[PDB]
Design a protein that fits this description.
part of a larger assembly, 5 chains, A: about 260 residues, C: mainly beta, Ryanodine receptor 2 (chain E)
């Protein structure tokens, strides 16, 4: 009889169009075959959706709505260029997210929503915009790093999830080490928090990361600090200010919970 | 030449430079659309490699100094005064070709458009001059569409110069495209540029075309065509009266239209003069019509406020009496028997006059033309004659559309050609000389 | 301040009082005649409460001087509404705004 | 049509109307011009009223050349009679004007000094009557936008004038205003000594005071007696009316005299405080011509006229509203119907790109810019543009895009962002959810059903500019999501019915222009979730009748759509599949 | 048309081969269709071989060999899921030493003068992984301390065992049947 089902209707229509005409538009071809593949692989929709499915109690519905609105603002800020207003909006959103009780009660929900990735990506955009010109919008990088460190400290699983991006944080490490009053709010601090007091993560830490940190420390011990000498500091031949930060990270890398990770 | 060496001593390879620029344009010519996908991709790869090699050898800069050394002279005549006259003609062509060369060198290449950011400010400083505006605009468009980094240095002054390009060089869609590229690049919106473009372009309402939704206005007139001329039998004073039976102040969002008065034809033709056949134009929107809306005297699309006891816009059960004096050009009104404190004077009396009313939707009015057709609720002023007395004897007084075309079935519509002049309107007796 | 010319008369006895919100349909026009706002276009009557400084001052005293059911024209000088900054994107700097205001209801 | 001639065209929209088609034309295979059109063809007629347009470069009689101004000279525009002294040359009076006007002040206040020179509002331009051209045939001065007179013989006595004499209660005329479209003088009478002037071409200088409206004329260094006083806000176009008696007739010398701004400082806002005379490319000579077409409206106002009786006179009654959008050219002080852009390509392109710029400035949730744009493009304008069937395709697509970008893009994006995430509250109505509507294992219609998954909140702010609050800058401007919904459903149904007949004239000129914007708006509304229950059932029946029967006409899927329309249909099908997936997820959560 | 879409995407100019979900799914579907897998009769074995030939023909008739060469060439020696799926598709179409597929691949490479294919092959070989005593010892230390394993397999040692086997099986299947042309071209 008739199709009687959206799956059958789409599967017939896509093939009929494709065999009727040679589709010129690659986007049209992709859309057609994506629909056909989705219709044929019905179980794939479930295997993709279920990981992003969370159930909440009825009492916390309004707080979940508020947290979702804040996260929507944060995600929407990914599509706009940085500015003073964007800085203010993200401080708003991050403060509200921190104050929300769901942020302390459902860590799996926040991991599934992928807000640590969103905050990291925004901080990445900020850092990549004017990376050489010191650090533009220091409050964005500081608040992003503080929120990310708090995310690591909330739960061990959150710490592992953030540790999964430790590699890139290391290329984005040498950003705000020299400037004081921002201590504890740099991507190096975020990496240290991801590896802090976790034997699994310390053991899984790879040699190339330590080599990167060692090269940074060697550079700081070899050449002076451009920002400090530009502000007028005496031109000693090396950079104790950043060398101390790198040594502090290496301390957490090597030492964990009273014992020393020999590897 | 700048150091003022003798023209004979200075050797400008003008012909070779132009020919090489043409060769370079052909060498960096983009792939054609009709080509197959594989050949297109191969030629795009070759173009990308050529652009990388040129930029790495620093050809972008060399083109920049060539452009600067050409702009040290103001015009082609000036360059022909300094250098040779043949170089004077070739100055425009070389200057254009260099700009197309720069555009082809940087087009679609992220690295080149990124390195062009430093000179981007220098590029926009010559956008105002006419000899290079098109090439500079094309290069600017390529840089903006390709390099996100270039948008980070565009400032308020740079945007205002681009808008002044609209202001001075007229309407152009390419600069609008450049502005859109400034607003959005690669799916990321720059709020600063959006706000500046908005606040610097929109409020003026002097460059972009403006749009507004306007009610249709139709004009209705009697058959009479009264005028004044030497040695002809027409009474120079006339009077008619209009009653408003119902009026909706706002049938739509826009205010309703209701104006009454007199209109004058151009010459002795029967057409109303100086006004569009259809649109939102009514009585008083041209210099051939003279209207009254209850608060303003309308003529030439400009309104003057007139005082009247308990003045108000024309409502239901409002009576307007119109008076015309062609002995000394004068148009006076009387609302509800009360005289309005203003009149039209010393207008043009070359053509014929007739009563006219202009309205939008939601209007229900009645002409009181006097005598058989109606009775005046107010006594006519002394001398003034009722308007029905001007009807030619055989014809019948009819209130018909002032304009030719009305709402009717499409294929039954009567297309009307030019009409003849009403020489019969002014019966001027001309006996032969004896 | 503001100049008020009456298009349609009102009752002439009921005027806005302190703390009483006014329901008005208005049309905003620049001095040259260009329209920039219309509650009639938005098809929603505009409600503001007299004297909380929530509407431009000229509109405020114009509505105050108007009576119930009256249709009046409000001419607001630059100083009384959007003095020098103007409205970004709508009202140019130093612009006089003409408003066609009708006091629909008082509550 | 000749003089006093009447005729009718029958394009055969209704074949029965054609009277001789059957006996000749039908068997031969000729088809009526309107063989299958859902709407009548727009007539275009010859415009009676002349308009000012730029002199064509290929004009057979007029030559206009721009002379760049040196340091010792001034920018000059020269009008040249190309075919003078030649066969078929035209000796009639030609009317010239400059493109941009000088705008007088809104309210009238009641070597050279730089301070006075910068604070003054007086502007000046001069015209050089070339030697050998009779000054009696040349008139110099200003005109307004209303000047549309093309009398072969022109004199200053027959200019259109009126005198509005406002008076007090007693009748005393406290003020009288002379209003005219033309304020010009004749050079022949202006030159006082007469005869010999060959020492330099007759230089009539026009001086305009934008703060007082005083128009004074300088002729060969001496003020003329004739002066014109104009009323505030008058836009005066520099104009010269001349009859060619020499190949060189006159020259627009755009310069300055002592203590006066040049004409450019008044014409252009960017050059307001620049005393140096300038002639930007925008300014150019325009001549009055008859070569222009006019478009008859498809629909006219319905007016009923009848004599009630001898007492009641004649009744004029118009009770049905009718509207059209007017495109206002700011520089020319002229307005034309937006549907006239079907033949004006340059204006159509410029306005389409203006619409695209409007869409771009408010892109990605620039709510305050959207609020500002609500002033320039309003709700009635958007609705009329959406519904009108005679709109050009480009403008139609632009207005459909602008509506979505200003009012719907933000929330549509928010729901698309929160579309792959299923936060399902554990409530009683959630527990009630089941995979299948009844015991019989038949799928319900997609979209219809109780969905309890968390959604973003719909919030909008009213765009009022009299308010001085700033909370309105959050949230997109409000729009009637119900009137828009019903209109979209109706237009989709009409498009489905009409397009199946394959008419020669679709809305916008092409099937793509007809369908892509409409389906895009429909998809945006579907994403936003406005459609509920019955509307969703109707729009599903529109998509495909047979599959979505509750519990011949062929749908869009088999309507044989173009590729751009097929992409939108793929998007709609993707949304329906996503709705099914969400229903499955909620049913699983309910069972759990 | 689907194969042509994928081939054009592979041949388009990019610095890096972007991960495409559509390709990663449809290549797997095509590979499954190709292979489609107690002692059986000679007739049954011949019917299996002939059925496999027809199943492989349904793709290499439409240009799958060129597609799987182009994707590997555009990979530019970067190990990834796209290359892992492409190698599986190539193995599926080349199973049994398909001489027609071998000839098609050889002719395509020779006429295109494709150097990126071989450069990417070498790069994939260098990027292939091996046993790591350090990783094994660290993982065993984690197990001995008894912390719950963060991942079930713990496949840090021999990161991708399937990718290497597929990469070398593809290269063997290329030369199977004593194909001297590949034996010399490689």
């Amino acid at each position: 009889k008739k199709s009687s089902t959206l799956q059958q209707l789409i599967s017939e229509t896509m093939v009929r169009w494709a065999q009727e005409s040679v589709i010129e538009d690659p986007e049209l071809v992709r859309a057609m075959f994506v629909l056909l593949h989705r219709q044929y692989d019905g179980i794939g929709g479930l295997v993709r959706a279920l990981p992003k499915t969370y159930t909440i109690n009825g009492v916390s519905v309004e707080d979940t709505i508020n947290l979702l609105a804040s996260l929507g603002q944060i995600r929407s800020l990914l599509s706009v260029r940085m500015g003073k207003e964007e800085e203010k909006l993200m401080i708003r959103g991050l403060g509200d997210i921190m104050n929300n009780k769901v942020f302390y009660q459902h860590p799996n929900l926040m991991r599934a929503l992928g807000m640590h990735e969103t905050v990291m990506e925004v901080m990445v955009n900020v850092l990549g915009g004017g990376e050489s010109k010191e650090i533009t919008f220091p409050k964005m990088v500081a608040n992003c790093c503080r929120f990310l460190c708090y995310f690591c400290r909330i739960s061990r699983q959150n710490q592992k999830a953030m540790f999964d991006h430790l590699s890139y944080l290391l290329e984005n490490s040498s950003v705000g080490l020299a400037s004081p009053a921002m201590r504890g709010s740099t991507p190096l601090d975020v990496a240290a928090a991801s590896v802090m007091d976790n034997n699994e993560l310390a053991l899984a830490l790879r040699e190339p990361d330590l080599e990167k940190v060692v090269r940074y420390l060697a550079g700081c011990g070899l050449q002076s600090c451009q920002m400090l000498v530009s502000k007028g500091y005496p031109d000693i031949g090396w950079n104790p200010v950043e060398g101390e930060r790198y040594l502090d990270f290496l301390r957490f890398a090597v030492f964990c919970n009273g014992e020393s990770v020999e590897e | 030449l700048s150091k003022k060496a003798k023209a004979s001593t200075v050797d400008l390879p003008i012909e070779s430079v132009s020919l090489s620029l043409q060769d370079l344009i052909g060498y960096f010519h983009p792939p054609d659309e009709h080509l197959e996908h594989e050949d297109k991709q191969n030629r795009l790869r070759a173009l990308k490699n050529r652009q990388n090699l040129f930029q790495e050898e620093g050809m972008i800069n060399l083109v920049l100094e060539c452009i600067d050394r050409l702009h040290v002279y103001s015009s082609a005549a000036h360059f022909a005064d300094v250098a040779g006259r043949e170089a004077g003609e070739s100055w425009k062509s070389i200057l254009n070709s260099l700009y197309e060369l720069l555009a082809a060198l940087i087009r679609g290449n992220r690295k080149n458009c990124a390195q062009f950011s430093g000179s981007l400010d220098w590029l926009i400083s010559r956008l105002e001059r006419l000899e290079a505006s098109s090439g500079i605009l094309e290069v600017l468009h390529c840089v903006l569409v390709e390099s996100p980094e270039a948008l980070n240095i565009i400032k308020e002054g740079h945007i205002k110069s681009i808008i002044s390009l609209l202001d001075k060089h007229g309407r152009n869609h390419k600069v609008l495209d450049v502005l859109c590229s400034l607003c959005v690049c690669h799916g990321v919106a720059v709020r600063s540029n959006q706000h500046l473009i908005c606040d610097n372009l929109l409020p003026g309402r002097d460059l972009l075309l403006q749009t507004r939704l306007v009610n249709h206005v139709s004009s209705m007139r009697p058959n009479i065509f009264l005028g004044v001329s030497e040695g002809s039998a027409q009474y120079k004073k006339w009077y008619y009266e209009l009653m408003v039976d119902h009026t909706e102040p706002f049938v739509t969002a826009e205010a309703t239209h209701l104006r009454v008065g007199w209109a004058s034809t151009e010459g002795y033709s029967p057409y109303p003069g100086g006004g569009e056949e259809w649109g939102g134009n009514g009585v008083g929107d041209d210099l051939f019509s003279y209207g009254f809306d209850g608060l303003h005297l309308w003529s030439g699309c400009i309104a003057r406020t007139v005082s009247s006891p308990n003045q108000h816009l024309l409502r239901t059960d409002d009576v307007i009496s119109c008076c015309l004096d062609l002995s000394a050009p004068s148009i006076s009104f009387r609302i509800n028997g009360q005289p309005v404190q203003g009149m039209f004077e010393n207008f043009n009396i070359d053509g014929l006059f007739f009563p006219v009313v202009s309205f939008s939707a939601g209007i229900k009015v009645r002409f009181l033309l006097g005598g058989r057709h109606g009775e005046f609720k107010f006594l006519p002023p002394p001398g003034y004659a009722p308007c029905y007395e001007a009807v030619l004897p055989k014809e019948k007084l009819k209130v018909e559309h002032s304009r030719e075309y009305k709402q009717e079935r499409t294929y039954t519509r009567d297309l009307l050609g030019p009409t003849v002049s009403l020489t019969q309107a002014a019966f001027t007796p001309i006996p032969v000389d004896t | 301040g503001v100049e008020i010319e009456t298009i349609s008369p009102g009752d002439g006895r009921t005027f806005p009082k302190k703390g009483q919100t006014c329901v008005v349909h208005y049309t905003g026009m620049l001095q040259n005649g260009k329209k920039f706002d219309s509650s009639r276009d938005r098809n929603k009557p505009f409600k503001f409460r007299i004297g909380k400084q929530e509407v431009i001052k000229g509109f405020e005293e114009g509505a105050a001087q108007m009576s119930l059911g009256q249709r009046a024209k409000l001419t607001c000088t630059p100083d009384v509404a959007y003095g020098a900054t103007g409205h970004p994107g709508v009202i140019p700097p130093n612009a006089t705004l003409i408003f066609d205001v009708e006091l629909l209801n008082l509550e | 049509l000749g003089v006093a001639q009447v005729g009718r065209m029958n394009f055969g929209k209704d074949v029965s109307t054609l009277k001789y088609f059957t006996i000749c034309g039908l068997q031969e295979g000729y088809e009526p011009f309107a063989v299958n059109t859902n709407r009548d063809i727009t007539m275009w007629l010859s415009k009676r009223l002349p308009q000012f347009l730029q002199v064509p470069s290929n004009h057979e009689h007029i030559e206009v050349t721009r002379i760049d101004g040196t340091i010792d000279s001034s920018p000059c525009l020269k009008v040249t009679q190309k075919s003078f002294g030649s066969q078929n040359s035209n000796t009639d009076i030609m009317f010239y004007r400059l493109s941009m006007p000088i705008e007088c002040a809104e309210v009238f206040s009641k070597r050279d000094d730089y301070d006075f020179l910068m604070q003054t509002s007086t502007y000046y331009y001069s015209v050089r009557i070339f030697p050998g051209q009779e000054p009696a045939n040349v008139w110099v001065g200003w005109i307004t936008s209303d000047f549309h007179q093309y009398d072969t013989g022109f004199d200053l006595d027959r200019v259109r004038t009126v005198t509005v004499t406002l008076g007090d209660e007693k009748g005393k005329v406290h003020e009288s205003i002379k209003r005219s479209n033309c304020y010009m003088v004749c050079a022949g009478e202006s030159m006082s000594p007469g005869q010999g002037r060959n020492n330099n071409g007759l230089e009539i200088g026009c001086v305009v005071d934008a703060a007082s409206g005083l128009l004074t004329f300088i002729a060969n260094g001496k003020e003329l007696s004739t002066y014109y006083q104009v009323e505030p806000s008058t836009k005066l176009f520099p104009a010269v009316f001349a009859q060619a008696t020499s190949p060189n007739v006159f020259q627009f010398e755009l310069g300055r005299i002592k203590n006066v701004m040049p004409l450019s400082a008044g014409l252009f806002k960017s050059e307001h405080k620049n005393p140096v005379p300038q002639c930007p490319p925008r300014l150019h000579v325009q001549f009055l011509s008859h070569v222009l077409w006019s478009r008859m409206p498809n629909q006219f106002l319905k007016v009923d006229v009848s004599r009630i009786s001898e007492r009641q006179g004649w009744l004029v009654q118009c009770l049905d509203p009718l509207q059209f959008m007017s495109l206002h050219i700011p520089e020319e002080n002229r307005s034309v119907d937006i549907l006239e852009l079907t033949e004006q390509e340059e204006l159509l392109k410029f306005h389409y790109h203006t619409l695209r710029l409007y869409s771009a400035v408010c892109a990605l949730g620039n709510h305050r810019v959207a609020h500002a744009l609500c002033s320039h493009v309003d709700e009635p304008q958007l609705l009329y543009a959406i519904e009108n069937k005679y709109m050009p395709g480009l403008l139609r697509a632009g207005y459909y895009d602008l509506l979505i970008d200003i009012h719907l893009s933000s929330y549509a994006t928010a729901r698309l962002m929160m579309n792959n995430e299923y936060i399902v509250p554990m409530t009683e109505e959630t527990k009630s959810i089941t995979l299948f509507p009844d015991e019989n294992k038949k799928h319900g219609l997609p979209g219809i059903g109780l969905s309890t998954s968390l959604r973003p909140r719909m919030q909008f702010s009213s765009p009022s500019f009299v308010s001085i609050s700033n909370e309105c800058y959050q949230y997109s401007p409000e729009f009637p999501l119900d009137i828009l919904k019903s209109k979209t459903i109706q237009m989709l149904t009409e498009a489905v019915k009409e397009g199946s007949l394959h008419a020669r004239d679709p809305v916008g000129g092409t099937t793509e222009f007809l369908f892509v914007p409409l389906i895009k708006l429909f998809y945006t509304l579907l994403i936003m979730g406005i459609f509920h229950n019955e509307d969703l059932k109707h729009i599903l029946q529109l998509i495909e009748p047979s599959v979505f029967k509750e519990a011949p006409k062929e749908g869009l899927l088999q309507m044989k759509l173009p590729e751009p329309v097929k992409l939108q249909m793929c998007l709609l099908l993707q949304y329906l599949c996503d709705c099914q997936v969400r229903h499955r997820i909620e049913a699983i959560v309910a069972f759990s | 048309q689907l194969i042509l879409l994928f081939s054009r995407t592979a041949l388009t100019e990019k610095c890096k081969l972007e991960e495409d979900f559509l390709y990663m799914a449809y290549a797997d579907i095509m590979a499954k269709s190709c292979h489609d897998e107690e002692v059986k009769s000679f007739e049954e074995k011949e019917m299996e071989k002939q059925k496999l030939l027809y199943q492989q023909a349904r793709l290499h008739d439409r240009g799958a060999a060129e597609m799987v060469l182009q994707t590997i060439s555009a990979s530019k020696g970067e190990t990834g899921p796209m290359v892992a799926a492409t190698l599986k598709l190539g193995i599926a179409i080349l199973n049994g030493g398909n001489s027609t597929v071998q000839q098609k691949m050889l002719d395509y490479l020779k006429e295109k003068k494709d150097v990126g294919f071989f450069q990417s092959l070498a790069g994939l070989m260098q990027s292939c992984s091996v046993l790591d005593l350090n990783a094994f010892e660290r993982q065993n230390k984690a197990e001995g301390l008894g912390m719950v394993t963060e991942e079930g397999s713990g496949e840090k040692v021999l990161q991708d065992d399937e990718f290497t086997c597929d990469l070398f099986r593809f290269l063997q299947l290329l030369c199977e049947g004593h194909n001297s042309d590949f034996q010399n071209y490689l």
